[PDB]
Amino acid sequence: KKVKLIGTLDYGKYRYPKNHPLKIPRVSLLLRFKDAMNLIDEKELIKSRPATKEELLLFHTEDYINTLMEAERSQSVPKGAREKYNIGGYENPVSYAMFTGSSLATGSTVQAIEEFLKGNVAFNPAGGMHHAFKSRANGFCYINNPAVGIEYLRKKGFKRILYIDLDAHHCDGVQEAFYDTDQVFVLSLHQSPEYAFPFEKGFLEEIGEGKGKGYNLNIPLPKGLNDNEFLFALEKSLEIVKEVFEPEVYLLQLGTDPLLEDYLSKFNLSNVAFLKAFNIVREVFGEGVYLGGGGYHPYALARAWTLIWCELSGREVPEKLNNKAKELLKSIDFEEFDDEVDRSYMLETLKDPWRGGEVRKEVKDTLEKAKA
Amino acid sequence: KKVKLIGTLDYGKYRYPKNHPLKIPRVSLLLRFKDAMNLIDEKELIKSRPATKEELLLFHTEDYINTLMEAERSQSVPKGAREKYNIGGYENPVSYAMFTGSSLATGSTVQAIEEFLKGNVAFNPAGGMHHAFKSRANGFCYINNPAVGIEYLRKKGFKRILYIDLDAHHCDGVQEAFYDTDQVFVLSLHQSPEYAFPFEKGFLEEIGEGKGKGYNLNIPLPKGLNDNEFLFALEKSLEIVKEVFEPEVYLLQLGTDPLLEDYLSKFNLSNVAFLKAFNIVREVFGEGVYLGGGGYHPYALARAWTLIWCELSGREVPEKLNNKAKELLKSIDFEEFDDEVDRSYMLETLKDPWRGGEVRKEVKDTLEKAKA
Ligand SMILES: CC(/C=C/C(=O)NO)=C\[C@@H](C)C(=O)c1ccc(N(C)C)cc1
Ligand SMILES: CC(/C=C/C(=O)NO)=C\[C@@H](C)C(=O)c1ccc(N(C)C)cc1
Ligand SMILES: [Zn+2]
Ligand SMILES: [Zn+2]
Numbered sequence: 001k002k003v004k005l006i007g008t009l010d011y012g013k014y015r016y017p018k019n020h021p022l023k024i025p026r027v028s029l030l031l032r033f034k035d036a037m038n039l040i041d042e043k044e045l046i047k048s049r050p051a052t053k054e055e056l057l058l059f060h061t062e063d064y065i066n067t068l069m070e071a072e073r074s075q076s077v078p079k080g081a082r083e084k085y086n087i088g089g090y091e092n093p094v095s096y097a098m099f100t101g102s103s104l105a106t107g108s109t110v111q112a113i114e115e116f117l118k119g120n121v122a123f124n125p126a127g128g129m130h131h132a133f134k135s136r137a138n139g140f141c142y143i144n145n146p147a148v149g150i151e152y153l154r155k156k157g158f159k160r161i162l163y164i165d166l167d168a169h170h171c172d173g174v175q176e177a178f179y180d181t182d183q184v185f186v187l188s189l190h191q192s193p194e195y196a197f198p199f200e201k202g203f204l205e206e207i208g209e210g211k212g213k214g215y216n217l218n219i220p221l222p223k224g225l226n227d228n229e230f231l232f233a234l235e236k237s238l239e240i241v242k243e244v245f246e247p248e249v250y251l252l253q254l255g256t257d258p259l260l261e262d263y264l265s266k267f268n269l270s271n272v273a274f275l276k277a278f279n280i281v282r283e284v285f286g287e288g289v290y291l292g293g294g295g296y297h298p299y300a301l302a303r304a305w306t307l308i309w310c311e312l313s314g315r316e317v318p319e320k321l322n323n324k325a326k327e328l329l330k331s332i333d334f335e336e337f338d339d340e341v342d343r344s345y346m347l348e349t350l351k352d353p354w355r356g357g358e359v360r361k362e363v364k365d366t367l368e369k370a371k372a
Numbered sequence: 373k374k375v376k377l378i379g380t381l382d383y384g385k386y387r388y389p390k391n392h393p394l395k396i397p398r399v400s401l402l403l404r405f406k407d408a409m410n411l412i413d414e415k416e417l418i419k420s421r422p423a424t425k426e427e428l429l430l431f432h433t434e435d436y437i438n439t440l441m442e443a444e445r446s447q448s449v450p451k452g453a454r455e456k457y458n459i460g461g462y463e464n465p466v467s468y469a470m471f472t473g474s475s476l477a478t479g480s481t482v483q484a485i486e487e488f489l490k491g492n493v494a495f496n497p498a499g500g501m502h503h504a505f506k507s508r509a510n511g512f513c514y515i516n517n518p519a520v521g522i523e524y525l526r527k528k529g530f531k532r533i534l535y536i537d538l539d540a541h542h543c544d545g546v547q548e549a550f551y552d553t554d555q556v557f558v559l560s561l562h563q564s565p566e567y568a569f570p571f572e573k574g575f576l577e578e579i580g581e582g583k584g585k586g587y588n589l590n591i592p593l594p595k596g597l598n599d600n601e602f603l604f605a606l607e608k609s610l611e612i613v614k615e616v617f618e619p620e621v622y623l624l625q626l627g628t629d630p631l632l633e634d635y636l637s638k639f640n641l642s643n644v645a646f647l648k649a650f651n652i653v654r655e656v657f658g659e660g661v662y663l664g665g666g667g668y669h670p671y672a673l674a675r676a677w678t679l680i681w682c683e684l685s686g687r688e689v690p691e692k693l694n695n696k697a698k699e700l701l702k703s704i705d706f707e708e709f710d711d712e713v714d715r716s717y718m719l720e721t722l723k724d725p726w727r728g729g730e731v732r733k734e735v736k737d738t739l740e741k742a743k744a
Contacts, residue, residue, distance in 0.1 A: 019565075019566045019567075019571065083455050083456055083458075083508075084455055086455070089572060090570070090571035090572045136455075193391075194391045195391075195709075198462070199391065199462035200461060200462045224711075337567075339596075
């Protein structure tokens with residue numbers, strides 16, 4: 001069961017516009033970072049390929065896909081496309097990520113799945129774009145690779161697919177995609193929609209409809225979440241899934257935005273808790289298909305996914321970043337959202353300190369209701 | 373030149389949905405607060421009236437207006453209206469504020485203007501909904517009363533109308549409405565679009581087009597803005613307007629969100645600086661039409677607008693809140709976004725301490741470029 005990483009430096013050419021949270025290097029950063037740390041060999045790396053039109057059509061509509069392609073080639077928003085397809089605004093702007101980048105990230109998810117079928121284990125850090133809908137862009141996402149991947153699997157004959165989303169935001173796009181089917185179970189932990197995007201969905205009451213009733217589970221969590229609360233929520237919810245769904249295969253979305261240093265979440269988690277969560281899922285369900293996800297702090301993202309890669313790769317996590325890695329991170333076009341924060345430790349060591357505390361009562365009550 | 377306040381308690385029945393920033397009482401709170409402080413007489417209060425369909429059509433389209441009305445009566449989102457009119461989402465949800473409340477706030481702006489014509493001075497705290505476009509809801513706004521009011525004025529024969537927006541967010545809706553005309557000058561101070569809503573407009577380069585070229589001025593400001601920086605920006609930009617535009621009449625939008633205690637802005641201003649800004653405008657352009665605006669902290673909003681009302685009303689600002697006022701604010705359905713903040717002083721005194729400091733170089737450079 002070989003361990004592979006799907007990616008390419010090319011993503012460095014498909015950044016989001018100047019002020020967009022996603023204009024920072026991410027997967028290409030991950031690759032250069034690991035290389036600087038000598039934590040990956042060319043043999044473990046699989047070059048990303050674009051998704052085929054056929055694969056995309058497994059979930060999205062022709063019209064939407066064609067609009068994305070036209071919008072990108074003309075680098076302009078086609079007539080009425082802005083309101084009909086939700087492209088062109090500050091959220092899902094025109095760029096070369098809208099189709100070329102997204103397609104490459106989606107094709108990479110299909111490759112990660114192909115490796116699973118071949119008996120290997122793969123990680124696609126560019127995937128996990130969980131917000132896009134069938135025919136509309138949403139939350140920075142143009143193409144929903146998890147939805148494409150899951151449909152890909154169903155067509156291959158799978159009837160019990162599990163999707164676990166650890167991203168700090170609710171996977172509204174994925175939830176909608178399989179809300180009415182019992183062949184797909186969606187489990188998501190995220191900041192409560194009461195105070196975080198998306199604000200319209202992600203509540204505990206949303207359990208699915210029709211045959212899918214009981215096959216969707218949302219675990220909304222409070223602000224200031226600590227490592228103990230996150231792992232508590234994860235463990236309890238996994239127990240709930242285990243007792244009602246026997247998955248033939250599962251996908252795990254690993255956005256790094258739930259980390260303390262990432263401003264797009266009110267969660268204050270550590271690297272180690274993030275890794276631990278990853279190992280907990282594997283202890284319960286074995287090996288699955290691993291995807292990336294939301295993450296807007298370059299240092300947090302690089303260190304966190306490096307931990308994930310070392311776990312899978314079976315290699316020891318070096319205590320500190322070597323000088324080559326420090327210069328890499330320092331050379332990035334970042335800038336902390338908050339002037340006085342002090343994140344210097346991130347350029348020193350890979351693993352951050354544990355960030356625990358007690359498990360709040362509301363968190364326990366939420367999991368309690370969930371079990372019902 | 374009598375001083376009037378346009379409003380009604382009825383707004384208390386048109387709150388936004390449960391988790392929306394605008395679900396808190398606002399204008400109705402203002403009214404009860406002033407009454408508890410004995411700072412207003414029934415004679416100074418003018419009951420708000422709905423806008424007529426004709427007044428609304430001065431700016432918005434029939435289709436959009438009809439959609440708002442239908443959406444509200446059926447309390448549902450009409451087919452395709454969500455994407456075509458941007459209603460129904462978490463930003464501009466279905467409620468009784470979408471049309472009844474909005475119409476009342478817009479009619480109130482027309483009344484404030486009618487009082488101006490009659491030689492009086494009026495303040496409409498419910499107005500200043502500066503985000504709505506001709507045919508689409510935006511930024512919590514369904515109807516753009518400033519745009520309706522300005523068009524109302526043009527039809528009355530005015531050819532030089534000035535609009536000053538002190539709300540912490542850019543008036544994209546108003547800017548678009550008069551971007552191509554020289555009969556209307558729009559001046560706006562706001563958080564730079566680089567980090568704040570709206571993110572697509574509000575940049576310094578947006579100076580207008582066609583005959584309106586040079587008749588739109590945006591003053592984008594940095595995070596952590598202090599009182600000295602705000603007044604510096606205000607004074608300098610006003611000088612710029614004075615030298616190129618001789619207004620026959622002007623409207624001033626007074627959203628309270630730029631205050632320290634309001635989480636929807638990275639500005640850290642004080643009550644007194646807010647009032648001072650108000651008096652500075654009046655010192656430069658005399659009496660105008662005063663409107664409300666964005667404001668999401670009930671205590672901040674009540675105290676700030678009370679200062680405004682006392683200024684206009686010619687009455688002394690009481691040092692502290694009496695017990696009746698304290699209980700009023702305390703009885704509100706609020707809850708601080710941040711657990712540990714300590715805003716107890718807000719329930720004690722009306723005026724907050726000055727929040728000054730030096731004027732950053734970038735702020736000076738921005739005004740510098742603006743003058744060009
Ligand atoms: C969509 C989203 C998170 C998605 C995610 O990570 N879900 O998985 C966060 C929004 C609310 C946000 O915070 C934001 C901030 C700045 C900005 N500009 C500076 C343009 C545009 C949007
Ligand atoms: C639109 C706006 C302010 C406009 C304003 O004040 N214009 O003058 C602010 C947005 C970005 C925002 O911060 C927000 C926060 C929470 C939320 N829900 C909890 C549903 C919905 C929106
Ligand atoms: Zn996220
Ligand atoms: Zn505002």
